Design a protein around this ligand. Sequence first.
Ligand SMILES: NCCC[C@H](N)C(=O)O
Ligand SMILES: [K+]
Ligand SMILES: [K+]
Ligand SMILES: [K+]
Ligand SMILES: [K+]
Ligand SMILES: [K+]
Ligand SMILES: [K+]
Ligand SMILES: [K+]
Ligand SMILES: [K+]
Ligand SMILES: [K+]
Ligand SMILES: [Mg+2]
Ligand SMILES: [Mg+2]
Ligand SMILES: [Mg+2]
Ligand SMILES: [Mg+2]
Ligand SMILES: [Mg+2]
Ligand SMILES: [Mg+2]
Ligand SMILES: [Mg+2]
Ligand SMILES: [Mg+2]
Ligand SMILES: [Mg+2]
Ligand SMILES: [Mg+2]
Ligand SMILES: [Mg+2]
Ligand SMILES: [Mg+2]
Ligand SMILES: [Mg+2]
Ligand SMILES: [Mg+2]
Ligand SMILES: [Mg+2]
Ligand SMILES: [Mg+2]
Ligand SMILES: [Mg+2]
Ligand SMILES: [Mg+2]
Ligand SMILES: [Mg+2]
Ligand SMILES: [Mg+2]
Ligand SMILES: [Mg+2]
Ligand SMILES: [Mg+2]
Ligand SMILES: [Mg+2]
Ligand SMILES: [Mg+2]
Ligand SMILES: [Mg+2]
Ligand SMILES: [Mg+2]
Ligand SMILES: [Mg+2]
Ligand SMILES: [Mg+2]
Ligand SMILES: [Mg+2]
Ligand SMILES: [Mg+2]
Ligand SMILES: [Mg+2]
Ligand SMILES: [Mg+2]
Ligand SMILES: [Mg+2]
Ligand SMILES: [Mg+2]
Ligand SMILES: [Mg+2]
Lengths: 117, 110, 34, 142, 56, 150
Amino acid sequence: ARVKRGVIARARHKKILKQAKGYYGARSRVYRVAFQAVIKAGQYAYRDRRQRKRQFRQLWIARINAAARQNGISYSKFINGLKKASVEIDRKILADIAVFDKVAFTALVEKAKAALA
Amino acid sequence: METIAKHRHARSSAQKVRLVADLIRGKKVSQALDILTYTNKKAAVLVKKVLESAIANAEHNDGADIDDLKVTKIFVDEGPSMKRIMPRAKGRADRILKRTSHITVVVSDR
Amino acid sequence: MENNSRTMPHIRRTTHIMKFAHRNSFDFHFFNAR
Amino acid sequence: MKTFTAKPETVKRDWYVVDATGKTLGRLATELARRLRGKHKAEYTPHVDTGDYIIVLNADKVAVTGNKRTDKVYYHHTGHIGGIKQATFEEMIARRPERVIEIAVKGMLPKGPLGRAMFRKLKVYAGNEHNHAAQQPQVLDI
Amino acid sequence: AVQQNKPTRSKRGMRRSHDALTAVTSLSVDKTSGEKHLRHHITADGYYRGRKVIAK
Amino acid sequence: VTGSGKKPWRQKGTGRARSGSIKSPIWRSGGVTFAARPQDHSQKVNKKMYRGALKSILSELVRQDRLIVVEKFSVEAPKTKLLAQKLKDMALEDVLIITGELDENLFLAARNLHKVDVRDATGIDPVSLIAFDKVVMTADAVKQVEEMLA
RNA sequence: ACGGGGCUAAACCAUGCACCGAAGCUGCGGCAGCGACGCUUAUGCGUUGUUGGGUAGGGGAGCGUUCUGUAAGCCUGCGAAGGUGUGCUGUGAGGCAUGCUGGAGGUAUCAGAAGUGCGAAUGCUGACAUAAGUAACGAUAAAGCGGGUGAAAAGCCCGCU
RNA sequence: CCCCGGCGAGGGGAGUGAAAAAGAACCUGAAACCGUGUACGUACAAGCAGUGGGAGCACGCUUAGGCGUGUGACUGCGUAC
Ligand SMILES: NCCC[C@H](N)C(=O)O
Ligand SMILES: [K+]
Ligand SMILES: [K+]
Ligand SMILES: [K+]
Ligand SMILES: [K+]
Ligand SMILES: [K+]
Ligand SMILES: [K+]
Ligand SMILES: [K+]
Ligand SMILES: [K+]
Ligand SMILES: [K+]
Ligand SMILES: [Mg+2]
Ligand SMILES: [Mg+2]
Ligand SMILES: [Mg+2]
Ligand SMILES: [Mg+2]
Ligand SMILES: [Mg+2]
Ligand SMILES: [Mg+2]
Ligand SMILES: [Mg+2]
Ligand SMILES: [Mg+2]
Ligand SMILES: [Mg+2]
Ligand SMILES: [Mg+2]
Ligand SMILES: [Mg+2]
Ligand SMILES: [Mg+2]
Ligand SMILES: [Mg+2]
Ligand SMILES: [Mg+2]
Ligand SMILES: [Mg+2]
Ligand SMILES: [Mg+2]
Ligand SMILES: [Mg+2]
Ligand SMILES: [Mg+2]
Ligand SMILES: [Mg+2]
Ligand SMILES: [Mg+2]
Ligand SMILES: [Mg+2]
Ligand SMILES: [Mg+2]
Ligand SMILES: [Mg+2]
Ligand SMILES: [Mg+2]
Ligand SMILES: [Mg+2]
Ligand SMILES: [Mg+2]
Ligand SMILES: [Mg+2]
Ligand SMILES: [Mg+2]
Ligand SMILES: [Mg+2]
Ligand SMILES: [Mg+2]
Ligand SMILES: [Mg+2]
Ligand SMILES: [Mg+2]
Ligand SMILES: [Mg+2]
Ligand SMILES: [Mg+2]
Ligand SMILES: [Mg+2]
């Protein structure tokens, strides 16, 4: 029962090189380099599913901070005021109203200034 | 209609013939023949005989006219190499490649 | 001896080529870590 | 829904003019770097230049505290061996005073192609006059 | 002295960006025979500048 | 493998991986690492396990309606056409015939029918009792299997 | 000899209230292991508690390849194996369908047996790169011209130096 | 058999054959490697060359929109096995 390897080994190598499309040089042509590059792309993709949640909250906070200072209050006093006024809107929606409905953001600031005073 | 002539297993490397084939790509065949006449390369002799043969194939087999033909495609491919042995110092042997090439000229009046 | 070389059948003893201490230009002052 | 990003073909940029007479050097430079980057706008995007154009007048009259007018030393190297060169704050003011504000603002900007394009919107002058009246710069009393 | 890394096909084509041939631009036309030739060279019939210089 | 035991090159100095034999299984044309021998693949079955397996197979042929008991089953001349006509008169196509002791008219007539095996009662085996669709035993063959299986 | 810019606080001490900050904790959705109790199981489901970083190493469960039986069956010139694309699908090894190429083989299911899975061993054999159109073209005794032949002559033939 | 070519090599027709990209360097014809064409990017820009975000352009769809494919300016993180 002698087994030859040609059909199985080619399909395994072709699966790796399909995932390595777009890569530079030997990373899209050569199996020894492409296999190594597909694994490093998988460690990066796992790590950046965690960093995607940090980088968007960092972006929302900087946009709330900019729009709150257009109404005379800082970020840390605007968040404290919305917590005292029991407003449960999160930073993703607050940064979105700050861009698309600037009047409705002013109404939230006056709600937060009222609870602090 | 396109018309092809080829020289297969031409005894020169593809890198040396590709320098001459880049001179006449896209030209009218009247202009391309006189560029090849005054190019001082051995590959210019080889490309001229393939272009002269593609011209004659288009007149005879395709009924074309000479004053409207242009070099639409021209490309040089690598052929098989002949392995030779070269003695070096102190008992060393190197391996000599004698590279060949495939020349392909396509003339078209459109 | 290397008796069945297909790349170089003409030669059997070849370490005068690549072994540094067996070349004809080897000097013993290269071996000074003593 | 995806988060808004500013598109560079539709970015609103404005023109301002700042008088630097008697201002502290670093406290003026942090506000300059905020507005060149665009941190004061709600449309802020970290990879888009959404900032403003700023004209700075009277760069030779900026102020520093302490003994920094004789003790702040600016270093650079020329690339040749032994070629380290220094200059005090007063030597920079007396020779090329627009460089003092430009160096301080460049160190507060991001490093890369985008921060080099943010720096291009800063227009520093040593005197009280500029020739950008066609851009109609608004007086920013910061 | 020899390389520590294999240079790429990108680096090979950048070096060959100065290897291109220049074509001769203006063959002259002899004013008696009408034959094309190089400038300041005789024709293949042996004319030069209107007269038969090489009776061959 | 045919070849000598000469070391292909020396141990140290040539700048190349060390070798000791041209017949190494790493090399092309070299030996097989765990090259095989002729072996005996036969297993032992206990006598009671062989007889206990036959009684279960025979009980399933009674249960799954695949066992046929007649009293007579033979042909009259050693002709293939006689048995093929006889079996389609009984709606039997693929069948094992077990008889008491073997008639040679029947043994010759079924040598060409590829779906039909004719056996005597002692030459049964557990695989052909499962591999054929129907099993026809004569009435004198059934009493021999009972004395064989105690 | 602040990470830098810069700083007379943007430094230090004391007190206070905010906010940022991790794969920690919470929220929502999903999978699996080990206990406990049960619509009742026939060995699976339901409820609940808890657990799930991992080398050496121990335990458990699977994928795929070639060959044998099932198979004188089933699929296939109305196109098999192989090759090359695309779509769908599973937690994974993988699976399924189909366009083009190819031109005669392939094989379900449940079992059985292994030359059963490769990136490394200065592994072995073949093919092809790189340096690179780079070094070199083998004695520094030496060539010049006219004619001939030829598709083509610095090197061949003839002649004179 | 005709044509180019040195009464070459090699090729283009024609013809045979189910097929000549089955043409004798001959079944199938993978990969490394080398070219031609097209779309997008690229000549103020610093590093394991990816990954997360993402504008523009091109080509398909199908609509009272924004999806698919290719490319990837700019930007956070990131020193192969
Ligand atoms: N006795 C002389 C044998 C020579 C051989 N080719 C060698 O290289 O040894
Ligand atoms: K021997
Ligand atoms: K197929
Ligand atoms: K290896
Ligand atoms: K080369
Ligand atoms: K010489
Ligand atoms: K074929
Ligand atoms: K081929
Ligand atoms: K290929
Ligand atoms: K990036
Ligand atoms: Mg030599
Ligand atoms: Mg010798
Ligand atoms: Mg070595
Ligand atoms: Mg063998
Ligand atoms: Mg016995
Ligand atoms: Mg038979
Ligand atoms: Mg620090
Ligand atoms: Mg908080
Ligand atoms: Mg978190
Ligand atoms: Mg967390
Ligand atoms: Mg957790
Ligand atoms: Mg674990
Ligand atoms: Mg854990
Ligand atoms: Mg089988
Ligand atoms: Mg198969
Ligand atoms: Mg297919
Ligand atoms: Mg094996
Ligand atoms: Mg391998
Ligand atoms: Mg390994
Ligand atoms: Mg071979
Ligand atoms: Mg070979
Ligand atoms: Mg080599
Ligand atoms: Mg060099
Ligand atoms: Mg040189
Ligand atoms: Mg030289
Ligand atoms: Mg010589
Ligand atoms: Mg001479
Ligand atoms: Mg002569
Ligand atoms: Mg034909
Ligand atoms: Mg046919
Ligand atoms: Mg055949
Ligand atoms: Mg073939
Ligand atoms: Mg091919
Ligand atoms: Mg540029
Ligand atoms: Mg510059």
